[PDB]
Each structure stands twice: as C-alpha cells, then as structure tokens.
Design a binder for these strands. Structure first.
Lengths: 41, 61, 55, 585, 102
RNA sequence: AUGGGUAUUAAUAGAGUUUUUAUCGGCAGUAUUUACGAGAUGUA
RNA sequence: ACAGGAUCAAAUCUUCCUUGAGCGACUCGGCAGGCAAAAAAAAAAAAAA
RNA sequence: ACACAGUCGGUACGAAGUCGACAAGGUAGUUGAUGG
C-alpha cells in the first residue's frame, strides 16, 4: 500500500525489490476487476 | 605505602593485623575498606570511589 | 565525517556499537557424546587402589 | 572556500594499553562541520524539515517516552524556539508528566533556562513546570521573573502565584513583588483569579494577612452587591468555600467573613430543603461542599453552633444522597466540635454511625480512620461498648484488604492508638500492616503525631516494630527543637517503653532532653555516657575494622536488542549487522 | 456499582433504576448497591412512575434483595398512581412480588 | 489527658540606612548592546 | 538545587537511585564597553555627585 | 578564487497531506531475506 499510492511515491521500494528477488530465488467494472485479479495472480 | 604512612595509628594497626596486602585485597574485591582508608585511597588516585556525599544546610518549614 | 577510536567502544550517543555483550550459545537438539558407566564394584576398587598411590 | 580541519596526534598514552570496555570521554571531531558547497534542493529540504517533523511528532506522541525520544532525536537541530519548548511542555503535561530528572527532559529544562529571557509568556512556562513538578527549574526561573512582575497581566501574576504554591516552594521576594504589583488591580480581579492567588499563598504558607483581609472584604462586598476568558466578578459558594479553606490553611480567623459564610450556607440549606422536585437539589452546593465547610470551621476552631446544627440537619434530611466518605468526615468534625449529649446531635450521629458501619466496605484508609475516631468520640444511647468493638472489628477486617494502598494519607498513629486502647489488643496482621505503612507519613508528622505513634507502640508492647521505633528516634533527634518539654519527655518515655531504640539514638536523645529541661526549668514530679565507636551502625564504615567481602557499586530483533542493551530507541531508523549479509547476497 | 454511591446525589430515581437494571443485565450481584439505592427510592416515592415501580420491583427481585419496607412502599405508591398502569406494566410489578415472596 | 482545644521561641508579607582622606590647579564628552516567539490554542 | 524518585525508611550530617559530564568551572543577566578627554615603556592609578 | 582568472557541467516542485493505504499484525499506515 505504501508503494501503490495514487499520487506516486517519489522513491521506488528497493526493500521490496530485494526481498522479492531473494524470495523468488530461494523459492466494464467487472472486467477491470478481472484484470486486477490477473495482476494479483 | 602512602596509605599506611598517612593513615591514623589505629588504622595502621588494623592494616598491620590484616593478612596480605590491603590494596591488593581491595582491588581483588576480597576485603571492604573503612571510610578513612577509602578517603586516603581517593586522595591518592584523584577521584572518588563511592558516591560522594556533600553536606547541605537545608531545612523544610 | 570519519571517526576512529583505539578501543573497542565508541562514545557516540545515537549510533550502535559493533562490540556488544556476549550471548549464551544456542542450544542443540542432539547429544555430541555417548557415555557408558563402569560397574560400581570395579569402579570402587579402582578408586581405592588409586587413592593411596596418589596421596 | 577552504575548510581548514585537521586531526592531530595529541598527547595520549597507549603503551601497554589495557582494554576495560569503557567508552572514551568524547568524540575526536568536535569542530563545527561547515559545508563549503551550497546544498541542493533535497539537501536543504532534509536540513530544514525538522521544523515541521518535530512539532508533528510531538503532537502525534501519546506518551512521555515518545515525546522525550523525539526531542532527543532532534536534539542537534538548531535553532529551537520558545514555541517549540512550550509545545513540548504542553504535550508532556497532557500525556501525564515524566520524571523531571531524566536526561532527555533535562535537555528541555536546560534549553528553557538558556532562553528564559527571550520568552514573552514566561509565566506559562512556569505554570507548565510547576505542573510537571520541575521544582528546581521553577526555583531558578524566579531570578528572571522578579524584574518582570510589574509588566505582566494580573491574571498572569495570579497563575504564577498558584503555580509556585502548587509545588510548595516558598519565594518570599517574588510573592511580595506580586502583592505590590497586584495592589491596584485586586478589586477588579475575577473571583476565580482571587481564589487562585490566595490558594498560591496558602500553598506557599506565606501568611500575608494584609492580602487575606483585603480579599475577604472584596468578597463580602461583591456578595452584598449580588444580594469567556476572564470569569465573572461575582463569586459563588464554591469560591467562598475555597477562600475559607485558604484561611484555614493560613490560620486566618476572620469572624466577620465566617459569619457571612454561615448566613449564606444556612440560607442555601433552607432553600435546598424547600426544593421539591428532586431535580434542583444540590443545585448551589454538594455534599463535598458541606464537608469542606464543616472542615473549615473545625480547623479554625470556630464553634458556629447554628451552622453546624443546620449542616447536621441537612445531612439527616438527605443522607441517602451523601457519599459515605462525606458522612465519615462530617461525623468526625461534628463529634470533635460539639457535645454528643444534645438530642439532635446524638440522633444524627447515631444514624450517621449506622450508615458508616453499613458502608465500611467502600471506605478507604482515611475514611476508616475517621470512622474509628468518630465511633469512639460519639456517645450512643444503647450498646456503647459493643458499637465501638464492632466498629474496630470491621476496621480491622477492612484494613487487610488495603495492604497495597501505598498512596492514601491518614493517621496511622491514631488508628493504632484506637485499636490498642482500654486493654484491647490489636490483630497482629493489621498492626504489622499499619506500622509498615507508617513509614510513608514520617515526613508529614507533627510533634503530636510523633507522641501519638510512640504512645501506640508503647501500649501495644505493654508486638514491637524495631525499625519503626528506630526511625521515630532518629527523626525526633533531628527535630528536637520542634518539641515542648512535656512532649519531648513523654515521647522519650514512650520510645524507651516500646522497646529501647539503638544506643546511637538513645544517648544523644537523653542529652537533648537534659538540655531542654535545663533551658525551660521543667522538672516533673515523677522525675548518659559519651558515644562509643562500637555503637555506630556497621552498615557505615567509621570503625577502622576491615571485613571480607565486596562493595557492589552496581544495583524487530535489532530494535529490541538496541533498546535493551544500548538503552535508546531507533524510531524510524533501521539497523543491520554483517551476520545477515548472506540473506541479501 | 461501588462508585454509584458517590454519584447518587447527581441522579434521579429513574437514572438510578436505569443504572441498576443495566448492571443486573450485565450480571452483577452486589447487595450493597441495592441496599443503598433502596433508601433513595423510598425517599423519592412521590416522583416515581408506574414503569419506575415495575422496574424497581423486577430488578430487586432478580438481585435477591428483600426489604419489606421497600416493597410495602412500592405497593402503596403503585396503588396511589394505579391510574397510569397497563397490563404488561402491572405484570412486571407483580412478578417481583411473586419472586421475592412479599 | 481512654488525648492533641496540648503546654515551646513566628524579625511574621518588610533584619531596612554612604566610609576614609582632603587648604590650593586639571579630565570626564559620546556610541554599541539583551524578545533571532507563533503574547495566542488569551485566564475554564 | 539535596532538585525529583524507591523502600518493613537512612547517627547527629541521605540507605540508595536519577541528574548522558546537574551547560568545561565559577559568576552576571540595568550584564557587557569601541571612541573622546585626562594619563600612560608592559601594566597600574579618579564611585557617583 | 586552489585558477593567464577561463572552459564543460551544475540543484529535479507537491506527502510540508491524512476524515491515510498480496499475506501478517498484536495496530507501529509496523512487517515478509538471513544458522555455522
């Protein structure tokens, strides 16, 4: 939520970048909602 | 030597009676010094060794 | 912007130390050694035999 | 420009250095870091944003710990301002105070003292400090307060006096200057501000009867005329009772003012009884107000029989609405003041004792002691002895339930004496609890309290609290001058009879009694050595003997560890050590 | 309940009855509160209404506090102001009597 | 004193005041400086 | 500042804890003193009226 | 100005707001990576 802010944070979330990298290494309204579900998946 | 030569006569007698060296025992934490002995030690080393008590003349009415 | 010190601890108020108090080693779930006890009578005999020879 | 900064060799000694794991005195670089290049937009914003974040985080803080942590975090940010200091103080008061000796708060206090002369509203700072209990800082600020009292507003001066009185700090020069400044403005001050000024004087125990008489005359005149930032000029019964309590504290016995107050209170009682719809009862006063009035008259020893009878009649009429604590206090004062042989007084006291014995389970230690005194000072019709015995039994049963009540103030000595009287023997547990709790009250004791507690202990022995007896002996030796000949003689007799104190107190006490007898030529009809070094306490080390032993001078994982060991809070900062590098590699 | 006595003087009979009923519903049994409240109820009989009397009877019956003087006063006042009663209110009033055996 | 109407010492809101040498001649005119607070969220 | 705090509570004279090192130490806050005059080897030497 | 005193570059608004904002929280608009 701190990164999905509408007006846009001035800075990228490097902490999320690094945590996600380590994790992966170590292992019309309804249509819009479906697209949101796709990005969630 | 400074402590022995500057302390009072009774304290000197106690020092003589004590087995071993008093300063060594104090530093090792084996014997508890007296107030006069601590005062002379503080005079030697330049700093207090316990919370120094100052005497004020204040009274609550 | 550089601060160097001869000793282990630094005096900065709001900066953490690198030399810290020691913590007890973490426990383990296995016994690294096995023990087997001598028979009490033979142990008593041996202790008695050694006692005079030593002291 | 060229930033001249060098690190020098110095004059240390590190040959055969020994590592003690003690910090060095100071940081090596103490010269100011003067940047020789202009900052960028981001750099300057980060430099200046403390002016917003400090106040924002002070407002967001809901604890003194958070407030002090934020202040310490911004300690190095200059330049702090009077409104910054005032916001910090106000937030501290609202969150509920803090230790005025914590070094984090000492930063704030030292900054306040540094910028004292630049404060426009110094009295507001002083009020905040008094509320926070920073007695030392408040005392220091009087130096700069003194030459500005004549320039402040009268309500500011009244608040200043109240703040000084609240911490019981006497500053006679300041109070005299305040009185001189308020001389021309007193008549126009609101009743609340007059009460504040007089309460400050009472708390400081400055007996300015010249001021008290003027205030009493002003209040009487305003009441006679009678018959949102300032406050009304015309007083109320509450203001009159507050001024009367101030007069009781300062021992100002103004019979005219008390006559006025008695007339007003009798009229109020009559109107309250006349009231009929049960919604306008206690409109002008309350049971606590009645208790305060009765206490005022008892303390001043002014025997207004009509007023006391009217108060007792009102209490009888509407006792179901009277809190048990109010009933206990009223009974105590009325029984101490009036004879119990009067029919009305006896009937009302009997009903009050019935209700109080009913409500014993709700009473605290003070109310219990007052009830014990009142139940014995009363003169009931039936079962005089059984009533007192049952009252004492109930008080004993209730005391055990208040073991941990280390906050309430009461007369431990009188309670113990009542429990041990007429051959009655106190319960061991209750006696132990009471003697344990008596230690808190020693700083509050009078000579009569000393005598009464010693009497109680002597009677109980003839159980013994050796520590309490020793403390009593030491304190009376310190406060020998406070005692009259008879008081000192009886106190020493009781001290000896309750188990003799240590010789270190017994001998000098005898010397003091001896000197007092000579000076006062006092020798009752019924009526040692020099101190030895062996009699001195062994906890101290005034003897030359040496003893085996020691003198012990000592008494989010990263965030938790730093808080536990280093002792400060990271807040938004984050810490990591090399031990966790492989998790990021 | 233990702090109610300190506020009894700022309340009315209706307010005290409401507090007592709420505490009874919560499930508190403290005879001291009921015994203290009885005195106020008896001192303020001239202002109680039919619902007030029924509520008082029911709450005291549920609490178990028994006082013949209180119940007689309640009955007398209810008879005095019987004109304002309804059938459920009368049943509520009489249920306390039935439960308390008065 | 079955005890605190109770014994003793309120200078208490006021502990406050301009010395010595010296017959006669001479200097003493000006500037700077303390609230770099948001009195105020004004007395509840 | 014995200023704040704890305790079956301290020899008169604080048993301890707090006060990051009670602002380097001690003071002042209508404090502080650049120029003139009058003096003047560095310095010192005039209270105001 | 360190400068035969010139040359090439040279600060990246607002959230300084707040009735804010997938999986956990022990509710901090805080947190997920890391045993020898």
């Amino acid at each position: 939520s701190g990164y999905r802010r509408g007006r846009g944070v001035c800075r990228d979330r490097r902490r999320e970048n690094l945590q996600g990298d380590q994790l992966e290494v170590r292992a019309a309204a309804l249509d819009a909602a479906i697209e949101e579900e796709n990005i969630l998946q | 030597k400074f402590v022995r030569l500057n302390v009072s006569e009774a304290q000197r007698q106690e020092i003589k009676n004590w087995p071993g060296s008093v300063v060594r025992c104090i530093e090792n934490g084996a014997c508890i010094p007296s107030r006069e002995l601590q005062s002379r030690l503080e005079q030697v080393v330049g700093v207090p060794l316990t919370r120094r008590k100052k005497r004020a003349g204040n009274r609550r009415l | 912007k550089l601060f160097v010190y001869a000793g282990a601890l630094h005096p900065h108020w709001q900066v953490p130390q690198v030399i810290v108090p020691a913590k007890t080693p973490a426990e383990v779930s296995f016994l690294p050694f096995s023990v087997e006890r001598a028979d009490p009578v033979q142990a008593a005999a041996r202790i008695a035999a050694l006692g005079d020879r030593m002291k | 420009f060229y930033y001249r900064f060098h690190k020098r060799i110095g004059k240390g000694n590190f040959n055969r250095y020994l590592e003690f794991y003690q910090k060095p005195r100071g940081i090596e670089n103490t010269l100011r870091l003067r940047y020789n290049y202009t900052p960028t937009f981001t750099a300057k914003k980060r430099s200046e944003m403390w002016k917003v974040n400090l106040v924002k985080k002070i407002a967001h803080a809901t604890d003194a710990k958070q407030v002090l942590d934020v202040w310490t975090y911004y300690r190095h940010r200059r330049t702090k301002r009077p409104y910054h200091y005032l916001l910090a103080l106000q937030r501290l008061v609202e969150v509920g105070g803090c230790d005025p000796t914590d070094f984090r708060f000492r930063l704030i206090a030292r900054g306040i003292y540094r910028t004292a002369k630049r404060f426009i509203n110094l009295p507001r700072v002083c009020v905040y400090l008094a509320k926070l209990n920073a007695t030392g800082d408040l005392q220091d600020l009087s130096r700069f307060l003194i030459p500005q009292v004549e320039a402040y507003f009268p309500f500011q001066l009244c608040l200043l006096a109240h703040a000084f009185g609240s911490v019981r700090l006497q500053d006679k020069v300041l109070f005299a200057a305040i009185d001189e400044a308020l001389r021309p403005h007193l008549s126009e001050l609101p009743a609340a501000m007059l009460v504040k000024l007089t309460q400050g004087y009472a708390g400081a125990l400055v007996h300015n009867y010249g001021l008290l008489a003027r205030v009493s005359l002003l209040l009487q005149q305003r009441v006679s005329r009678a018959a949102r930032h300032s406050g009304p000029l015309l007083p109320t019964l509450h203001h009159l009772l507050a001024f009367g309590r101030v007069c009781a504290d300062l021992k100002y016995q103004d019979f005219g003012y008390l006559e006025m107050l008695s007339i007003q209170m009798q009229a109020a009682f009559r109107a309250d009884l006349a009231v009929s719809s049960s919604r306008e009862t206690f409109q002008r006063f309350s049971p606590f107000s009645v208790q305060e009035l009765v206490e005022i008259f008892h303390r001043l020893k002014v025997n207004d029989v009509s007023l006391l009878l009217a108060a007792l009649r009102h209490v009888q009429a509407r006792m179901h609405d009277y809190p048990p604590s109010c009933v206990a206090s009223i009974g105590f004062c009325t029984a101490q003041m009036l004879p119990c042989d009067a029919s009305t007084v006896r009937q009302v006291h009997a009903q009050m004792l019935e209700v109080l014995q009913e409500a014993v389970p709700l009473l605290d230690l003070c109310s219990l002691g007052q009830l014990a005194a009142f139940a014995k000072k009363a003169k009931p019709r039936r079962n005089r002895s059984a009533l007192r015995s049952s009252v004492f039994e109930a008080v004993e049963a209730r005391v055990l339930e208040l073991q941990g009540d280390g906050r309430t103030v009461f007369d431990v000595g009188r309670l113990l004496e009542l429990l041990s009287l007429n051959g009655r023997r106190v319960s061991e547990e209750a006696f132990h609890i009471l003697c344990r709790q008596a230690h808190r009250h020693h700083d509050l004791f009078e000579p009569q309290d000393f005598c009464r507690l010693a009497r109680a202990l002597a009677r109980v022995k003839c159980l013994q609290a050796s520590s309490l007896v020793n403390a009593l002996a030491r304190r009376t030796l310190r406060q020998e001058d406070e005692f009259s000949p008879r008081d000192f003689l009886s106190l020493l007799r009781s001290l000896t009879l309750a188990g003799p104190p240590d010789r270190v107190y017994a001998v000098p006490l005898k010397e003091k009694l001896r000197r007092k007898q000579v000076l006062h030529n006092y020798f009752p009809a019924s009526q040692s050595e020099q101190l030895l070094e062996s009699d001195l306490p062994p906890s101290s080390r005034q003897t030359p003997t040496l003893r085996k032993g020691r003198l012990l001078l000592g008494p989010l994982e990263e965030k938790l560890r730093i808080a536990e060991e280093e002792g400060w809070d990271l807040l938004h900062r984050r810490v990591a050590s090399l031990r966790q590098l492989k998790g990021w590699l | 309940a233990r702090q109610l006595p300190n506020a009894l003087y700022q309340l009315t009979g209706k307010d005290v009855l409401r507090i007592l009923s709420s505490l009874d519903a919560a499930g508190l049994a403290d005879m001291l509160a009921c015994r203290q409240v009885a005195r106020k109820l008896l001192a303020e009989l001239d202002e109680l209404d039919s619902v007030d009397l029924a509520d008082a009877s029911a709450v005291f019956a549920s609490q178990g506090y028994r006082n013949p003087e209180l119940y007689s006063a309640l009955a007398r006042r209810a008879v005095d102001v019987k004109d304002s009663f309804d059938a459920p209110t009368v049943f509520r009033l009489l249920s306390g009597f039935s439960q308390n055996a008065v």
